Amino acid sequence: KGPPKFKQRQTRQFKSIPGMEGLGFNHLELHELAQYGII
Amino acid sequence: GPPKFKQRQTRQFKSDIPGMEGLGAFNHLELHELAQYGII
Amino acid sequence: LTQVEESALCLELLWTVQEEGGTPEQGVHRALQRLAHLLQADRCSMFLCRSRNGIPEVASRLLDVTPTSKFEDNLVGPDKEVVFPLDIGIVGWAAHTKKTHNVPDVKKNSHFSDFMDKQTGYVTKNLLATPIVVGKEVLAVIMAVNKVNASEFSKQDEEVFSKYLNFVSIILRLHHTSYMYNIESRRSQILMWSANKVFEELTDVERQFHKALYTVRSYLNCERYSIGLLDMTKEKEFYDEWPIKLGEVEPYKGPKTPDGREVNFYKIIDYILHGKEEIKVIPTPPADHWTLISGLPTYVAENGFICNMMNAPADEYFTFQKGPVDETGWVIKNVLSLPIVNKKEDIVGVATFYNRKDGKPFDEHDEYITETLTQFLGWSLLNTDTYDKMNKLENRKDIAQEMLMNQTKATPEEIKSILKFQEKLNVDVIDDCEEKQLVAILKEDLPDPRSAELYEFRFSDFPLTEHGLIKCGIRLFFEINVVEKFKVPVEVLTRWMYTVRKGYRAVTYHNWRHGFNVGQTMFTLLMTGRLKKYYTDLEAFAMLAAAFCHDIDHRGTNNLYQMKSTSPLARLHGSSILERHHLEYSKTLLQDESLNIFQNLNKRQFETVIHLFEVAIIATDLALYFKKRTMFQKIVDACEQMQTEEEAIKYVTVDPTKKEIIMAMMMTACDLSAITKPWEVQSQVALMVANEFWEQGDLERTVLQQQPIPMMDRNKRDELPKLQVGFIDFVCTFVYKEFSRFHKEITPMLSGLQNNRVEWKSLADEYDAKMKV
Amino acid sequence: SELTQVEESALCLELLWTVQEEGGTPEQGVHRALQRLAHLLQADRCSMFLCRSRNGIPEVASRLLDVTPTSKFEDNLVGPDKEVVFPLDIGIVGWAAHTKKTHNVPDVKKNSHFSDFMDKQTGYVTKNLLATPIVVGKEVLAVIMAVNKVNASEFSKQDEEVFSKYLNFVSIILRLHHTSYMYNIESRRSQILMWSANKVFEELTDVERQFHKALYTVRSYLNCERYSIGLLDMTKEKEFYDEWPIKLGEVEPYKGPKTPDGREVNFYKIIDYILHGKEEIKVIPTPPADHWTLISGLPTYVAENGFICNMMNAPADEYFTFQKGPVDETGWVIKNVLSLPIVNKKEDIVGVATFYNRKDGKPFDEHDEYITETLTQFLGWSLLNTDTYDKMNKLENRKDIAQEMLMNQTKATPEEIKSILKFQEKLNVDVIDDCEEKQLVAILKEDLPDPRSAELYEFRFSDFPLTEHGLIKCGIRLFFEINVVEKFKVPVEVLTRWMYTVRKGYRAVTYHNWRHGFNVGQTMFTLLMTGRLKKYYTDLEAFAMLAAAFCHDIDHRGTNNLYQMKSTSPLARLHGSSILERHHLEYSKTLLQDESLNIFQNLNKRQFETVIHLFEVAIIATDLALYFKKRTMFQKIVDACEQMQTEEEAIKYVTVDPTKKEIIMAMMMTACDLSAITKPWEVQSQVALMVANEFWEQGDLERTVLQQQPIPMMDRNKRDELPKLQVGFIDFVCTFVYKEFSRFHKEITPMLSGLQNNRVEWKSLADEYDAKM
Ligand SMILES: Nc1nc2c(ncn2[C@@H]2O[C@@H]3COP(=O)(O)O[C@H]3[C@H]2O)c(=O)[nH]1
Ligand SMILES: Nc1nc2c(ncn2[C@@H]2O[C@@H]3COP(=O)(O)O[C@H]3[C@H]2O)c(=O)[nH]1
Ligand SMILES: [Mg+2]
Ligand SMILES: [Mg+2]
Ligand SMILES: [Zn+2]
Ligand SMILES: [Zn+2]
């Protein structure tokens, strides 16, 4: 005959976050270190 | 002194399974010769 | 009391039981107010019972219940309730024993506590306590005190007491069961949503924890809560331990986790929900942070206890903020702090939940909900560790593959060895010359195909060196005129040929010479065998390129050895292991812009090239050929019955499937072409193949501890010729006879095979003469 | 009527007390309430019909029938096997439950809502009806009816009022039971989610093992007599050689059940959980169509459509052809079935879970569908963990393959070793090495360069008149010179292969090629020997120190750490700090892992741990930032050592503290790494030009691909600033190291002296540039 009526899955319940944007040496030496790529 | 505080619960959810031991083209004469040559 | 007013009053309490919406406190007030008139007593009370930190206690809920007194005055809010431990007071003793208690002369009782007496200024002399008990749990204790005009009370006083606490028990059981259902629904929803957000995707500790804690904010009835994540660095670098080991800096003293790490909160995510909802992520928070102002998060990190605190600023150990902290008037009242633990029991974070929305102190049920949430978050760290390990594996794989191309790719000196622009263009610095000049000079330098016998089926690579084989391969690519048609760069083509040469290992048989022999054989089939008629120029360009790279990076072992040794190749590719490896490496070589001979092709032409590469290289193995022999045989039989040649050409070329089958059989004929060579070449190549098989057999006998088959056994070396006869009669003869029938121009190829069999028969016969005596 | 009211109140009180008997059922209380209502309204056969919801549609079923005064409860109760089920759109009961209002019909024949099925079923005639639904929280629980008033033909208002009054209390008892049942349901659901999360995060495994773990753990909470799960084959696309017969017309195309995305419904595995007896569990791989789960079409229907199928009286259905008799020889008859699909992230059907008849005789309510749907959703989400496990396995295998291929390409071939260890031209021995080790040592020590010649011991050594093969020979000579090959019995062929592989690991970059590594190794040798620093270290430490000095810059790409950070290189993502230094250390240890390259093969395990730690310290120390951080500590060590007037006592002061030895080693490796500044003027000029050229190439490439302006040190357009800039490098970095080493040891005085000479020359070029302006 025919199949009985059945119910569809309730995927609407989980079908679908603030704050996630940022969530994922000597004083004289620093200039010369940046000059030579040491840092 | 500090107040008395509850101890963490780990024994109940600490907790082998049966049935897990096993849960992890050619012709008639060809089946022997394919072996001799390493074809399979 | 007469029976009629008793029945009317019973109906009144019956309608009282049916709340149909409302609060249980009103119904309990009504019964208690009725009881005093039935007991001729005053000041009945309720003492609701809770459990915090596993320690039970009682707290007053209704007080000064006297007949006809308005409810608002009798109800005691959470700000003015008094709490008794079960070892203090007759209420505590009754809750402990779960039995009805009635004692006169309370000053002579050993359990009576007078703290409420001095607190309220009221004196009690005769009392009656009876806890409401359901399911081994005491919900409330009902108290009736100070009988008027009499002492010692009465037995019928206790009888009507029990008969009205039956109504009280009905109301309290209803409310408690509804409350338990609500908290269980909240817990199930918390688990469900946390699971959904964890299984959304793979992320680190911070993002996963933030998603899980933000989604479930509606089910944690807390005004504010936060999570602080400790540093997980177990050991320090050598140079950071140099100042400590030298004694120049005093060793760290202070808070420490049970594993021994220093208590350093690297980030603290605050969820403020009481007014406007905000989420604040503070990396490396200061010690003045409102969560960290008290020592409770540090205490939890040091100890790992689930800390419940009611009236936290009233404590003396923890320096909780007595006044408002964020200048919004919000004041800490109740605190609950739990640790989140790694499988190895390390404390990863501390989750602190501040004062409850209802205003009541945290009881056993909120501890249950939050403990389940923190247990789930602790278990969820497998996904974070797997994410980190995935990133490490991917980076290491990319690094290893990059250092392989630098090693495999031909150096510019090797390119200049073939395309000698310098000695003939006087540029010597940059390849700024026109492609026409490069094509011309390479055409002069490359050897003549006719003199080298590159067009014949008898071609042997024995006289030539491997550099000569590279030059002959570039000449073969020039002969099909695909370099000018598809605008193949000359330097790129030379670099690709040299890289394919360097990709082949130094194994006994499957070296660069085998790859060049297969490529030259397929060039012979296309040109001398006249099999090009079914294929376009682009298809021919792909097949000679796939022919040259069919056995690329062959380790010298069979597919059976890959399966039996459980090599990474076998665990990566299920079937046709080495063929899929060769296809993958050829595609990897073609991905480079400096090596891609198919640079100047459309997307559809490149997709055709890749599909042809797949078909040609996968068809190399003999299992697929042994399975698909019959379909090629049927194609050949169908093409034999045609009256004219162009009808057969159209019949083959209309269906791409038949072209694929013919290409697959051409691959099979090419990788087995060494049989069709003259005897002076076939003998050498057969000894090479046998030596490779014997080396594999030695590997099987030594490593796998298995006895090899007679093909790969050294001790059966004198059985080599007869096996070769079988190898001719079982594998090669079918494809070569079918191709001889298909094209008469391939007749010499098959013919050569027939000769080699004659020789391999004679070498067998001598053995039969040697073993006979 | 005073006695009447007293009796009614007492009877209602007893009816409410009956809920307090633990271990009973609410049906007893409802039955006694029904027998008293009938007595009250003078009626017979009062009935209660419960309400259920299956497949999303509501229905009513029999729970209490033929209730009359003085009637046995057990006879009036109707079991689950005799209950009659009516949909809401049929029957007076259905409309009473639909409207959620009181329905009093005096003549049942005048209503089109009448259903006579119960009249025909038992041969009873019905003429009067009064029906009420029990509605709390906007949900219907049961429908209560009084039928066939014996002494009247009509139910009056007073009768309806008494009806409402008594089923208010009936509603109270039903609300209590319903709240308890829903609490139990949510507790089971939360436990299922909790345990499934425990088992999923326990380990990263495949689909089968993970699903089996989760299902066997939540076994106790499914509350079903038997259930199974059948997993479909997820292979979506066929191989080309398996598609050839389809496209040739040889084999007819498939026609049958198909998964909605388009796949073939092929249950490739079934796991049966038997719970009615012996707790048997079976795994059927490749189950047949005769399997009792698959004998009916329900699992195939669920795979084809993705519905949730709730079936009561399954064998009575005509569509699915369920088994009417016992399924197995053991007596078990399928009664109620609940089948649900498991759904992937892309909404594909992965498995079908089928739950058979409940432990009690009742059918599957909506709450069991709720619980099982939550379980299947959790499994479908954990499919992400399974997919990540497979992707991790593929990544690990691909990384292993790439590393093996790279090691084969990098390792020195036997021909290259034969160019240094000429075993044949001197011993007349075949390729197979059966020679004694001492013979190999003797014949290698005659073919290596003279240490006293070529100034291998001096600070003025220049590699310009030496070819790179000569550099390899000189390095093996250096290893022979510190007397570690015989002391630690390392193999000679292993040492030669290790050094040739180390040379081949260095790329062809302008400055950081193999010559830089050899110069640093040679400078380490001279600092140890000529600089007299060997007195601070043991022979093993000198061995590991030389080996770390040679590999300190292995596989250098010509770009510094800043370019690794800015371009987001895989090295930068894998290693956070000291990117290139950690890469060099990792690759050196990878080279040492192979037994044919393990130069530390024959030493103890503790010695190997010490050697690995020294390797790490020495290689990481070449990061210049670390040198700028620990230079002060080295200065303090030198200042402390300067004050002692005895050499032995300074040696003792350094030796007993391993931290001091490590600090001195780190600056020894830094002093070696910058040794080119101490070379004579021609060598320094050429090497400085090479360094500047490499920096200019890095700057040009940085500008080309990063779109960033290079610093003037790496900018080509500032090439005329090379002299002046160089003096800054002399005044800022190198002078501290060499001045403190000259203070610490007078024998390292020449190095600093050479530096000062260079500082003159780079000044003479600098001032001239100021004259050029
Ligand atoms: N003010 C007040 N005190 C009460 C009431 N009911 C009981 N108490 C007292 O509060 C006390 C708390 O501790 P106990 O158990 O010793 O004894 C209890 C009585 O003495 C009440 O309704 N009002
Ligand atoms: N034999 C019998 N029939 C009943 C009893 N109670 C109700 N019914 C009838 O059963 C019927 C089922 O369908 P309806 O809703 O039309 O109406 C119901 C009544 O007419 C009972 O106690 N015994
Ligand atoms: Mg091959
Ligand atoms: Mg370096
Ligand atoms: Zn091949
Ligand atoms: Zn260096």
Residues sharing a CB contact under 8 Å with residue C319, sequence separation 6 or more, in sequence order = C293, C294, C295
User: What span, in angstroms and rounded, lies between the C-alpha atoms of C71 and C333?
Assistant: 26
SS3 D561: helix
Q: What topology is assigned to D2-184 in CATH? A: Beta-Lactamase (3.30.450)
For the sheet with C83-85, list strands across it: C83-85, C55-65, C42-52, C137-145, C127-134
**Tokens for C112?**
């009576």
**Tokens for C601?**
């092709």
What's the gap in Å between D55 CA and the centre of ligand 2? 25
Q: Degrees (nearest 5) of the Cα angle B37, B38, B40?
A: 125
Q: Degrees (nearest 5) of the Cα angle D531, D535, D539?
A: 110
| Residue numbers in B near D214 (CB within 8 A) | none
* DSSP run (H or E) holding C351: strand C347-353
User: What span, in angstroms and rounded, lies between the C-alpha atoms of C452 and C433?
Assistant: 30
User: What span, in angstroms and rounded, lies between the C-alpha atoms of D462 and D464?
Assistant: 6
Q: Helical H runs in D536-621?
A: 539-550, 561-566, 570-574, 579-593, 605-620
- Which amino acid is present at C44? C
Active site residue C175: no
Residues sharing a CB contact under 8 Å with residue A24, sequence separation 6 or more, in sequence order = C203, C204, C206, C207
Q: Helical H runs in D42-152?
A: 73-76, 91-99, 117-122
Determine contact, residues D108/D128, Cβ cutoff 8 Å. Answer: yes
Strands C224-230 vs D85-87: parallel, antiparallel or unpaired: unpaired
Q: How many residues does chain C have?
A: 773
* DSSP run (H or E) holding C131: strand C127-134
User: What span, in angstroms and rounded, lies between the C-alpha atoms of D464 and D469?
Assistant: 13
CATH node for C412-628: 1.10.1300.10
Residues sharing a CB contact under 8 Å with residue D219, sequence separation 6 or more, in sequence order = D273, D275
Q: Among D103, D178, D512, D575, which one carries the catalytic annotation?
A: D512
Identical fold, D2-184 and D411-451+462-652? no
The secondary structure of residue C718, as a DSSP letter, is G
The secondary structure of residue D308, as a DSSP letter, is B
Q: Helical H runs in B1-40?
A: 30-37
**Tokens for D111?**
């209503």
D69 C-beta neighbours (distance < 10 Å), count: 11
User: What span, in angstroms and rounded, lies between the C-alpha atoms of D299 and D312?
Assistant: 16
* DSSP run (H or E) holding D66: strand D57-67
The verdict on a CB contact (< 8 Å) between D216 and B23 is no
Q: What is the CA radius of gyration of chain D?
A: 45
Q: In D334-379, which ranges are E strands?
A: 336-343, 349-355
3-state SS of D168-235 is: HHHHHHHHHHHHHHHHHHHHHHHHHHHHHHHHHCCCCCCHHHHHHHHHHHHHHHHCECEEEEEEECCC
Q: In C232-264, which ranges are E strands?
A: none
Dihedral over alpha carbons D306, D309, D315, D317 (to 10 degrees): -80
For this experimental structure, what is the resolution in angstroms?
A: 3.0
User: What span, in angstroms and rounded, lies between the C-alpha atoms of C589 and C500?
Assistant: 8
Ligand 2 site residues (CB inside 6 A) read D 45, 47, 65-66, 91-93, 114-115, 118, 122, 124, 126, 129, 145, 147
Residues sharing a CB contact under 8 Å with residue C214, sequence separation 6 or more, in sequence order = A17, A18, C271, C279
The secondary structure of residue C703, as a DSSP letter, is I
Determine contact, residues D297/D271, Cβ cutoff 8 Å. Answer: no
D168 burial type by CB count under 10 A (0-12 exposed, 13-18 middle, 19+ buried): middle
Of A8, A11, A39, the CB nearest to D625: A39
Determine contact, residues C97/C87, Cβ cutoff 8 Å. Answer: no
Provide the phi-psi class of D317: left if phi over 0, else alpha when psi is between -120 and 50, else beta: beta
Query: Nearest to residue C595, comparing CAs of C471, C491, C482?
Result: C491
User: What span, in angstroms and rounded, lies between the C-alpha atoms of C249 and C241?
Assistant: 10
For residue C470, CA distances in Å to C519, C523, D128 come to 11, 15, 104
C762 burial type by CB count under 10 A (0-12 exposed, 13-18 middle, 19+ buried): exposed
Determine contact, residues D670/D621, Cβ cutoff 8 Å. Answer: yes
Determine contact, residues D403/D220, Cβ cutoff 8 Å. Answer: no
Of B13, B15, B23, the CB nearest to D283: B23
Q: In C176-294, which ranges are E strands?
A: 224-230, 265-272, 278-283
Q: Helical H runs in C61-154?
A: 71-74, 89-97, 115-120
**Tokens for D647?**
């050499």
Q: How far is C294 from chain A (nearest CA, A)?
A: 25
User: What span, in angstroms and rounded, lies between the C-alpha atoms of D642 and D649?
Assistant: 11
The secondary structure of residue C83, as a DSSP letter, is E
The secondary structure of residue D94, as a DSSP letter, is H
To the nearest 10 degrees (0 to 180), the angle between helices D2-17 and D157-200 is 10
B9 burial type by CB count under 10 A (0-12 exposed, 13-18 middle, 19+ buried): middle
The ligand whose atoms approach the alpha carbon of D556 most closely is 4
Determine contact, residues D195/C195, Cβ cutoff 8 Å. Answer: no
The secondary structure of residue D14, as a DSSP letter, is H
* DSSP run (H or E) holding C145: strand C137-145
User: What span, in angstroms and rounded, lies between the C-alpha atoms of C737 and C636?
Assistant: 11
Determine contact, residues C386/C356, Cβ cutoff 8 Å. Answer: no
**Tokens for C106?**
């309370």
- Could you tell me the sign of the dihedral formed by the alpha carbons of C236, C242, C246, C247, in that order? negative
User: What span, in angstroms and rounded, lies between the C-alpha atoms of D591 and C52?
Assistant: 60
Residues sharing a CB contact under 8 Å with residue D376, sequence separation 6 or more, in sequence order = D340, D341, D342, D343, D353
Residues sharing a CB contact under 8 Å with residue D507, sequence separation 6 or more, in sequence order = C406, D513, D555, D556, D557, D558
User: What span, in angstroms and rounded, lies between the C-alpha atoms of D144 and C682?
Assistant: 98
Query: Does residue B2 sit at the C interface (CB-CB below 8 Å)?
Result: yes
Determine contact, residues C309/B2, Cβ cutoff 8 Å. Answer: no
Determine contact, residues D271/D314, Cβ cutoff 8 Å. Answer: no
User: What span, in angstroms and rounded, lies between the C-alpha atoms of C575 and C573?
Assistant: 6
Determine contact, residues C497/C544, Cβ cutoff 8 Å. Answer: no
Assigned superfamily of D411-451+462-652: 3'5'-cyclic nucleotide phosphodiesterase, catalytic domain (1.10.1300.10)
CATH architecture of C203-386: 2-Layer Sandwich (3.30)
Q: Whose C-alpha lies nearest to ligand 2, atom 17?
A: D92
Beta bridge partners of D587: none
- Which amino acid is present at D106? P
Provide the phi-psi class of D295: left if phi over 0, else alpha when psi is between -120 and 50, else beta: alpha
Determine contact, residues C276/C270, Cβ cutoff 8 Å. Answer: no
Query: Nearest to residue C448, comparing CAs of C463, C468, C418, C467?
Result: C468
**Tokens for D94?**
């259905």
Assigned superfamily of C3-181: GAF domain (3.30.450.40)
Query: Nearest to residue C593, comparing CAs of C417, C409, C344?
Result: C409
What's the gap in Å between D651 CA and the centre of ligand 6? 28
User: What span, in angstroms and rounded, lies between the C-alpha atoms of C265 and C301?
Assistant: 10
Residues sharing a CB contact under 8 Å with residue C318, sequence separation 6 or more, in sequence order = C294, C295, C296, C299, C309, C312
Determine contact, residues D64/D27, Cβ cutoff 8 Å. Answer: yes
Determine contact, residues C322/C374, Cβ cutoff 8 Å. Answer: no
A18 → chain C, closest CA residue:
C279
User: What span, in angstroms and rounded, lies between the C-alpha atoms of C94 and C364?
Assistant: 20
User: What span, in angstroms and rounded, lies between the C-alpha atoms of C381 and C212?
Assistant: 12
Tell me the CA end-to-end span of chain C in Å, nearest whole number.
131
**Tokens for D125?**
């005639």
The verdict on a CB contact (< 8 Å) between A19 and C210 is yes
The secondary structure of residue D290, as a DSSP letter, is T
Which experimental technique did the depositors report for determining this structure? cryo-EM
SS3 D635: helix
Assigned superfamily of D206-390: GAF domain (3.30.450.40)
Q: Among C510, C554, C581, C582, which one carries the catalytic annotation?
A: C510
User: What span, in angstroms and rounded, lies between the C-alpha atoms of D194 and C686?
Assistant: 65
For residue C256, CA distances in Å to C263, C300, C338, D180 come to 5, 10, 16, 46
- Which amino acid is present at C448? D
Residues sharing a CB contact under 8 Å with residue D296, sequence separation 6 or more, in sequence order = D314, D320, D321, D322, D323, D337
Q: Collect residues with CB below 5 Å from ion ligand 4.
A: D 553, 622
For the sheet with D309-312, list strands across it: D281-285, D267-274, D226-232, D349-355, D336-343, D309-312
The verdict on a CB contact (< 8 Å) between A3 and D301 is yes
Determine contact, residues B21/C323, Cβ cutoff 8 Å. Answer: no
The ligand whose atoms approach the alpha carbon of C518 most closely is 5
Determine contact, residues D591/D520, Cβ cutoff 8 Å. Answer: no
Query: Does residue D285 sit at the B interface (CB-CB below 8 Å)?
Result: yes
Q: Helical H runs in D18-84?
A: 26-41, 73-76
- Which amino acid is present at C505? R
Q: Helical H runs in C504-644?
A: 512-527, 537-548, 559-564, 568-572, 577-591, 603-618, 622-640
The secondary structure of residue C702, as a DSSP letter, is I
Determine contact, residues D96/D131, Cβ cutoff 8 Å. Answer: yes
Query: Nearest to residue C543, comparing CAs of C555, C553, C531, C554?
Result: C531
CA atoms within 13 A on the CB side of D222: 27
What residue segments make up the domains of chain C, in order of their start? 3-181, 203-386, 412-628, 672-773
Beta bridge partners of D139: D136
Beta bridge partners of D132: D144
D527 C-beta neighbours (distance < 10 Å), count: 25
**Tokens for D133?**
């639904």
Q: Helical H runs in C641-746?
A: 645-654, 656-671, 679-699, 720-727, 733-742
Pocket test for ligand 2, best of D118, D148, D150 (most atoms within 8 A of CB): D118
D61 C-beta neighbours (distance < 10 Å), count: 19
Q: Degrees (nearest 5) of the Cα angle D244, D249, D253?
A: 90
Query: Nearest to residue D320, comparing CAs of D330, D329, D309?
Result: D309
Determine contact, residues C62/C29, Cβ cutoff 8 Å. Answer: yes
Determine contact, residues C670/C521, Cβ cutoff 8 Å. Answer: yes
Determine contact, residues D183/C181, Cβ cutoff 8 Å. Answer: yes
**Tokens for C190?**
């918390």
Q: Collect residues with CB below 5 Å from ion ligand 5.
A: C 550-551, 671
On whether C45 is known to bind a ligand per the annotation, the reply is yes
User: What span, in angstroms and rounded, lies between the C-alpha atoms of C4 and D9?
Assistant: 10
For residue C79, CA distances in Å to C60, C75, C333, C359, C525 come to 11, 11, 10, 8, 97
